[PDB]
Design a protein around this ligand. Structure first.
Ligand SMILES: [Fe+3]
Ligand SMILES: [Fe+3]
Ligand SMILES: [Fe+3]
Ligand SMILES: [Fe+3]
Ligand SMILES: [Fe+3]
Ligand SMILES: [Fe+3]
Lengths: 158, 158, 155, 157, 157, 159
């Protein structure tokens, strides 16, 4: 079953994203962006919570879950500035949205109304996540035009 | 794109509805039905809030909103009793409902799960609204069979 | 449209039917001195009645004619002889409850009745939880009843 | 004795029957935009079910075997055309409810079943109150319904 | 009466300004200036409240009100930066002020003391509004001389 | 010190690996209607992840570069068929967690890295408590499961 493999994968995607968020916190912390680091860390925990929510529903609905490996984050090796980090995070959220939409498609094809109902809050959370990340990225990109100015986004606002 | 156009039209319909409700408040106040007036004023505000909720979601989801003219209400030229006003308000809500349904249809066809999730509470609200306005119109039509009687219940209820 | 309106009317019957079966289970348990299991069944009986009354309220608001049907006599109680038999029947009840909701949602879907489908969502998720809760209780009951008297300690 | 046990089972059914009849009254009232009277009937529907539950509880304690019967479909609601028709059916229902409790009490009395007679006492008094209140409402409805629209006033109370 | 047509006009002008504020909110939100967007959204609501205030007064004083179309905001098509938006909003407020002054003019010629009294707080509100928009626009125009810096006005409020 | 810097990195991986193993135990228990044991495992999964994050934080402060590695898929779950099997695996996991900390501490001792040793101290004591508590639960489980049904009683009662 496709629906069931995709549900598994979704758990994996949430934990993958949690680890990518953690990688972002690390790069920020190492480069003394403690505000952006705390934001990424908080998002890491929340992504893990989403994974757990998927796990709990699957268990209730007798969808067998077998935990997969959580792949090592790869984009950190390339990051040179906060702009690069926030852009990777945007891509991560876009990919998170795409995987949920694929899972919803499979559910819709199966007439699985319970799964579709379960996913609705996630669909709306993704809209809010891509908007928030996108907006932060816009701010960072604008402020990084003047040397040192972005270092005030961090200290003040986050 | 059909879903962008319909999403924009939904915004217009909410604000059109807001103005129609305001027109109703005005007719009521000018004819000394202050309770019925207060109710229409409350609704006018709430319809505008729905509109703002659509705009907010559209902004987040990158659906470009271009605000359109809000047309002049016209039913208020033909009103001559409260019954006429409540009947037009029922028909407004029926058109608000139809319009949400067209939107949902477009989103369904596009497999736009986030838009469909967003609309759900509005579908349920429209059930409530058509029911509440139907009920008031029934009461108005019944009480208006005895002279003076309708007036005694603007003054009490509302 | 006719099919959707009659399935909605028959969902009310299903909810009340399930209420009565829960009540039946409560009775068997009380008669056989399982007051803890009887209390649980009595609470679910009230809750299934409330679900019915939710369906009724919604139909009234959406102008779906409701005509209340006979609520059938519960019949599994004639054959229950252990708690296990009762909880197995309640599990079957919930699985049937789930299928009737899914059929209704299937007819709404066909009719493009977005409002009805939205109404049903919380109920689909409630049935997921109900089947899981019942299934778990039955697993426990089945395991504990392997030793004489032990199940009496769960109650 | 057999007859007493029969009648006790029956009473449970009668309570749940009346619960459904009150629900049918709520429905007709809601459908016809009498939300106040519909609220009233809904609350009574709940209450009748609680009475039935109290009989089941007692029977279980006293080892009167109960076996739940079908709850018949309400029938009056097909022919109601105005609130007067509904309140009239509900008065009859309560009148019927009183008769079955009195019959059950007769059977208990013949058996010298003092515990059953004691259990029934608060219900006999509740039935007096119920018939009084329903009768009183029916009287208002029937009076106020002589002026078009005036009964809609009662409902907003 | 010109006095009556101008009073109706004024309602349309308050609602037009509400819609124009809403269009500025949208442009800001779409361009990730969430602080400016919130500010414009609150002003949109307040202009609607002013309109509603004129409507209520007109009803009380038997000034027949007939609601006009609220035209579509047009400046938003050409905005490219926050400076452009704020400049349009200043122009809206200036227009808002002239219209109130024209209404007061008509009221004065008619010796309509009640309308003049009703308008007093709005005249003083407009002085405040022009001053406040003018001051934000001066900050915006100054800060936008250094790339990124304006993005700090938004974030700090 | 590269040995030190690698072992520290590997310790993060070990804490997150343990987090996932505890999640897998939680899942087994839930699937098999042991909701009390499943809650306990879930709690422990969060706690191990917290330890991992504490090691990350200290590394960042101390300029020990952390590069996150793959967190391996739990595999003991395939073999579990009773709660005893699950708790046995979790004992062995903790024993492994203990050995990894001790090896890290050895490396820090060789390097005279007093700050790393001081940092590890609370974890060494936590590991004593952890092994003791899992070992104790495993003893109870093993005893109660000698009578059919009895172990259920103590998922539902206790936990
Ligand atoms: Fe997520
Ligand atoms: Fe609306
Ligand atoms: Fe149910
Ligand atoms: Fe009764
Ligand atoms: Fe103004
Ligand atoms: Fe650890």
């Amino acid at each position: 079953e496709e629906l069931l493999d995709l549900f598994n994968r979704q758990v994996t995607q949430e934990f993958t994203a949690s680890q990518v968020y953690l990688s972002a916190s690390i790069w920020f912390d190492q480069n003394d962006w403690e505000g952006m680091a705390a934001y990424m860390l908080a998002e890491s925990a929340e992504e893990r919570e989403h994974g757990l929510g998927f796990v709990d529903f699957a268990n209730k609905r007798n969808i067998p879950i077998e935990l997969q490996a959580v792949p090592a984050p790869v984009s950190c090796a390339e990051w040179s500035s906060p702009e690069d980090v926030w852009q990777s995070i945007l891509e991560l959220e876009q990919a998170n949205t795409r995987s949920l939409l694929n899972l919803a498609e499979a559910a819709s094809t199966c007439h699985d109304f319970a799964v579709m109902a379960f996913l609705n809050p996630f669909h709306l959370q993704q809209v809010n996540a891509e908007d928030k990340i996108g907006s932060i990225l816009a701010k960072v990109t604008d402020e990084n035009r003047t040397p040192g100015l972005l270092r005030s986004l961090d200290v003040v606002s986050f």
